[PDB]
């Protein structure tokens, strides 16, 4: 939104379960939610080329 | 012979290591403590009534 | 903005210790069935 | 060289007892005496039959039956502890308590009357002076009000509704439309408050209190949570005063409470003479509300029967005992409910004092009440902040 | 009384058919305790809504 | 001359009295931190 | 007999963990409702 995001900024996504909370947010964008993975040097020099 | 308190401030050395923000959290800027700093020796009293 | 900023730092601190206290009265509960079970 | 022994009438020589004396008390007459027929008022009746329900609760207060006359101790002590907590706040130590500050506010009307006395440089000298100083100050009030245009509460804090905390300054209009300050400003004893619509004040509080406070003598201007204090304490003080002098205690006794039942000059001038000096040279922490009970009693009573709420079947009272008893309430939840009925009392204070007639008033609340009939009862009351009676209907 | 939180909340919020109800879906049984305590965003009955049918898919999915 | 059973029944005992106070101690904890962020933040 | 104690302590656990897991859950929930 306006100032770089910190760790507490980022959550993580819970699949699977009830997130009834996350779902009422999709509009918001300071809370930025993750997938739980990252990508490596490889996989992202491929997805850039 | 005496010691300098130069040798026994390097011997004893820093532990701590923490970020600070400023109260609109524009800026972050870190802290060191020494372990030999005069300020350990004083009597200090410390509270934060709400 | 910072009373926001203040409230939600004081708010998850206290949610890491509600589960802090809640896993040594755990612990002590664990411990004292093993106990009463099997010495 | 402290007296142990205090007078509150002329009637019998000052009585004699060792510490503590409402506990002293109430433990001797529970003792040496039978309850079992004594009674408090109609209103102790229907809140002891209100918390007698609660199991937990009856316990404590040791309501074993409701259609018993009689109130156990601990019912007692619990109420007056409540009452007594009212007015100090154990969180922040007061560096000025309310008696200090409304000599002071007294002092600095009277410095034109104290010129012609000899300077004095404590408060040893304005508290045996105030008698004399503070009816010219009622006759002012008077006029005052008699003059100045604009539930009657003449003495109400214009607060913000959203406000429910004591302490702070304040809202700029709370001060507002109370006529005393008028007159304060009106004389010269406050020059200005800060959000209106060295004074003599600062220098009177200085020589008065330079020895407790050591050279810190905060100002009560800037600091004027002080004022409010002070304020509602000069109020109560000239109340009382008012009442006491009204009616001689010498007058023919119609109730048949009397002291020995409880055993088995100037009316104000009596009362001065221990209740103010000793006090304060045993203690400087006393309040109102440890010389008078029985006012914040009333007072507490007044707003409720009111209807006044100070956000906008609840006693203030009852709610704050809960808040100490209960270990559920927090730190800063009986503050607030400790504020709140700090509210109640000092509006019902302001709408006392607003009526013409508060004698009549306060008769009339005693008789339908707390049993109190006469002015030796109401004096009592007043003292012990409650009123024993044999239960003989 | 749960009954008409679970009541309101199936019929207001969720907007269900009557042909559906907490005793023919044990999905909805469980999710109602949940839903019940978050007495807030009842305005965005989306994200209930898209809440239920993940939680129906993740009941049905082979694990 | 009693049994060791009785022993780690009267200790067990002595550490869910320690849990029954440190219950209470939780429950001011909470309530003093709830009402001192109501004060400051929330207003 | 100890098997209650131990079914009575076992049932402490279980609110244990399902206390906490409910004032993380509602603490999160209120976190992202009115402080975003």
């Known amino acids: 939104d306006r100032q770089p995001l910190n760790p507490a900024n980022i959550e993580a996504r819970h699949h699977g379960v009830s997130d009834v909370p996350r779902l009422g947010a999709m509009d918001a964008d300071e809370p930025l939610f993750v997938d739980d993975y990252r990508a490596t040097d490889d996989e992202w020099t491929l997805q850039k080329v | 012979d005496e010691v300098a308190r130069t040798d026994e401030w390097k011997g004893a050395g820093v532990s701590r290591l923490r970020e600070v923000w400023d109260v609109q959290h524009r800026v972050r800027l870190r802290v060191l403590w020494y372990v030999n700093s005069f300020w350990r020796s004083r009597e200090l009293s410390y509270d934060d009534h709400e | 903005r910072v009373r926001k900023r203040y409230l939600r730092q004081e708010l998850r601190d206290l949610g890491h210790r509600v589960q802090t206290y809640c896993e040594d009265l755990e612990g002590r509960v664990s411990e004292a069935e093993a106990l009463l079970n099997q010495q | 060289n402290v007296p142990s022994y205090f007078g509150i009438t002329q009637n019998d020589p000052f009585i004699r007892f060792h510490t503590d004396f409402r506990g002293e008390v109430v433990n001797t007459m529970f003792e040496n005496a039978s309850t079992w027929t004594f009674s408090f008022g109609i209103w102790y009746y229907r809140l002891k039959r209100g918390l007698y329900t609660q199991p937990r609760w009856k316990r404590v207060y040791h309501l074993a039956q409701m259609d018993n006359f009689s109130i156990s101790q601990e019912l007692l002590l619990g109420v007056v502890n409540a009452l007594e907590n009212v007015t100090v706040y154990p969180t922040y130590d007061c560096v000025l308590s309310d008696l200090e500050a409304a000599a002071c506010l007294l002092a600095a009307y009277g410095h034109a009357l104290w010129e012609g006395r000899d300077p004095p440089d404590s408060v040893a000298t304005v508290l045996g002076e105030l008698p004399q100083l503070l009816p010219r100050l009622a006759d002012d009030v008077s006029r005052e009000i008699a003059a100045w245009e604009g539930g009657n509460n003449y003495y109400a804090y214009r607060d913000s509704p959203d406000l429910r905390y004591y302490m702070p300054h304040y809202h700029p209009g709370t001060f507002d439309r109370h006529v005393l300050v008028r007159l304060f400003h009106k004389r010269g004893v406050i020059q200005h408050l800060p959000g209106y619509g060295d004074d003599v004040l600062s220098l009177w509080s200085r020589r008065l209190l330079v020895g407790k406070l050591g050279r810190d003598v905060p100002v009560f201007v800037h600091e004027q949570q002080y004022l409010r204090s002070g304020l509602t304490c000069l109020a109560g003080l000239l109340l009382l005063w008012k009442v006491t002098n009204a009616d001689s205690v010498f007058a023919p006794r119609t109730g048949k409470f009397t002291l020995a039942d409880l055993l088995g000059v100037r009316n104000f001038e009596f009362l001065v003479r221990y209740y103010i000096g000793p006090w304060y040279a045993r203690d400087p922490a006393v309040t109102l509300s440890q010389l008078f009970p029985g006012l914040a009693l009333l007072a507490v009573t007044e707003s409720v029967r009111s209807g006044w709420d100070p956000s906008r079947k609840s006693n203030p009272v009852a709610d704050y005992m809960f808040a100490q008893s209960s270990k559920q309430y927090g730190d800063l939840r009986r503050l607030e409910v400790h504020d709140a009925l700090l509210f109640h009392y000092e509006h019902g204070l302001g709408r006392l004092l607003s009526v013409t007639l508060p004698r009549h008033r306060v008769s009339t609340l005693g008789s339908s009440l707390f049993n109190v009939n006469d002015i030796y009862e109401l004096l009592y009351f007043l003292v012990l902040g409650f009123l024993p009676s044999v239960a003989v209907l | ?63 | 001359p009693i049994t060791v059973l009785t022993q780690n029944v009267l200790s067990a005992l002595e550490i869910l009295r320690l849990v029954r106070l440190d219950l209470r101690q939780l429950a001011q904890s909470v309530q003093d931190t709830i009402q001192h962020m109501r004060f400051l933040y929330l207003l």
């Open chain 5, 1 to 63: 009384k749960r009954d008409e939180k679970h009541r309101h909340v199936v019929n207001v919020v969720l907007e269900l058919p009557t042909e559906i109800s907490e005793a023919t879906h044990p999905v909805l049984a469980t999710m109602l305790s949940k839903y019940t305590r978050m007495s807030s965003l009842f305005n965005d009955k989306c994200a209930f809504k898209l809440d239920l049918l993940r939680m129906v898919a993740v009941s049905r999915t082979r694990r």
